[PDB]
Amino acid sequence: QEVTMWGDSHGVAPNQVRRTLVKVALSESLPPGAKQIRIGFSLPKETEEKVTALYLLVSDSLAVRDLPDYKGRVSYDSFPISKEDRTTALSADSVAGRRFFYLAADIGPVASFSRSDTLTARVEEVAVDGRPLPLKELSPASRRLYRGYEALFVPGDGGSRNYRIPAILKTANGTLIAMADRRKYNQTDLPEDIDIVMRRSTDGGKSWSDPRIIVQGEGRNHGFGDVALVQTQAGKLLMIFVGGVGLWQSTPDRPQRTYISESRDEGLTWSPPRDITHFIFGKDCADPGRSRWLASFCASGQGLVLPSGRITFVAAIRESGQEYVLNNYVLYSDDEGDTWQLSDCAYRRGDEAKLSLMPDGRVLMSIRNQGRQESRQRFFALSSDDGLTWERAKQFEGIHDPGCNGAMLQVKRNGRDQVLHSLPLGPDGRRDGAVYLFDHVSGRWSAPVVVNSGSSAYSDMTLLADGTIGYFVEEGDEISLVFIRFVLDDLFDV
Numbered sequence: 001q002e003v004t005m006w007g008d009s010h011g012v013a014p015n016q017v018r019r020t021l022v023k024v025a026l027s028e029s030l031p032p033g034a035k036q037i038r039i040g041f042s043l044p045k046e047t048e049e050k051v052t053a054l055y056l057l058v059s060d061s062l063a064v065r066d067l068p069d070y071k072g073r074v075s076y077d078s079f080p081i082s083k084e085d086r087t088t089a090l091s092a093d094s095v096a097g098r099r100f101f102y103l104a105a106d107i108g109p110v111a112s113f114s115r116s117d118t119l120t121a122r123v124e125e126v127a128v129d130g131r132p133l134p135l136k137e138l139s140p141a142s143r144r145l146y147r148g149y150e151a152l153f154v155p156g157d158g159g160s161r162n163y164r165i166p167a168i169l170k171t172a173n174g175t176l177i178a179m180a181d182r183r184k185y186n187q188t189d190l191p192e193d194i195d196i197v198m199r200r201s202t203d204g205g206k207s208w209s210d211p212r213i214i215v216q217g218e219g220r221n222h223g224f225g226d227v228a229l230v231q232t233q234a235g236k237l238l239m240i241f242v243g244g245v246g247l248w249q250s251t252p253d254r255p256q257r258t259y260i261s262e263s264r265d266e267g268l269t270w271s272p273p274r275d276i277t278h279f280i281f282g283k284d285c286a287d288p289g290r291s292r293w294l295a296s297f298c299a300s301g302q303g304l305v306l307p308s309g310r311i312t313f314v315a316a317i318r319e320s321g322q323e324y325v326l327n328n329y330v331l332y333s334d335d336e337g338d339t340w341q342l343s344d345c346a347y348r349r350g351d352e353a354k355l356s357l358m359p360d361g362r363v364l365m366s367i368r369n370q371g372r373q374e375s376r377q378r379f380f381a382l383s384s385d386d387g388l389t390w391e392r393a394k395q396f397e398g399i400h401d402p403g404c405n406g407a408m409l410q411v412k413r414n415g416r417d418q419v420l421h422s423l424p425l426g427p428d429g430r431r432d433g434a435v436y437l438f439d440h441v442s443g444r445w446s447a448p449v450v451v452n453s454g455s456s457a458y459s460d461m462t463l464l465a466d467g468t469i470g471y472f473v474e475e476g477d478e479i480s481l482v483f484i485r486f487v488l489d490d491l492f493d494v
């Protein structure tokens, strides 16, 4: 009879309730004759000052996230603990054979958000009728306080086993749109059966509407996913996504197709999806130079609408069946989405790529590094004719890319034009989701700041009206899509 212990490392926000600090698992139910179990724990004053109440939670489930995040799919009992106390006890008849125990807290109304605000606790002893059990730590507890923190899509939500692939969008009217792959049966990509789902917020991300499936997968080989979002200059919302067979299964005559859909009511309703594959490649393509290309997909997340009105996304395109590599081209529209063209090639052996507007009006491309090329660094390219043509810009390199989709934001910080870039820190793996600041004038990257430790993958980033960063990340091995709000001073001041 051993006891295994996991401290929580997920972010918190003020006034949240029943946040797990430490969870422990009995390897066996309490034996008959056992009457009581007692849990002694430690918790520093700095954490105690940040909480308003403590709890012992007991459940038949051993869950990854805070138990309220499973919205009742996890049932549990809650016994309060005085925040000044350091032990609690419960009869074996109350535990009722259950094996999983949580030390949880209600977060106070803290108002600091510096890097120092880290909550922690640790279980020191689990005793059954006075007989202390052996406890082994698999994880330490450290939960950082952010101005906002909320899991928008959690495994099991609405009957979908999994979620992946975040996209976020802020509209000129302040509406936030959050979309995701609804991965119904497992976490793998197309050709699995996948839907596109969405939640909206009309109060700057304080609260979100219930998820609505806006594009429905119709079976294996007939799913949809990899959403990217823009707002066009005329005000209509534009989403772009792929559907069908997997990327490497696509062919010119049986392609994984690219679709667009639009919204003229702040993301409440969306037009029926429109196949635009024929503009890009394949059997219906008017350019015979691309008749025999095999596959294309736009990087999920956000595109870019230029000052001219031109709408753009970077497609990553498979041109040859003899290799498993992709080339980047800009997919753009000068007519509010009515028609679409391709730029000249922007990057050889690229992958998911993102655009942002340089302070001089040039366009910067950030290209995912696939296959651990070169020094395993993020790739960059520049365009000075609004996306039509491109050249490598090593001058922007200098951050590691373990091979993952990220996002850029052009921000002004202490009077300096800078670029915020989100990527897993790694190294060489999907761990510790971070952001970096690139100072434009010096051409120097900051040191990374880890927003979310642990398993971390795709991220997308939006700038809120007052300059708070909205950061939408894939958290965990079984991924949750988590919306985090912070200001740049919270992460980069000393």
Ligand SMILES: O=C(CO)[C@@H](O)[C@H](O)[C@H](O)CO
Residues within 6 Å of the ligand: 009, 064, 453, 454, 455, 456, 475, 476, 477, 478
């Ligand atoms: O996988 C998970 C789920 O949240 C955790 O184990 C954590 O993200 C990482 O794996 C280690 O901290």
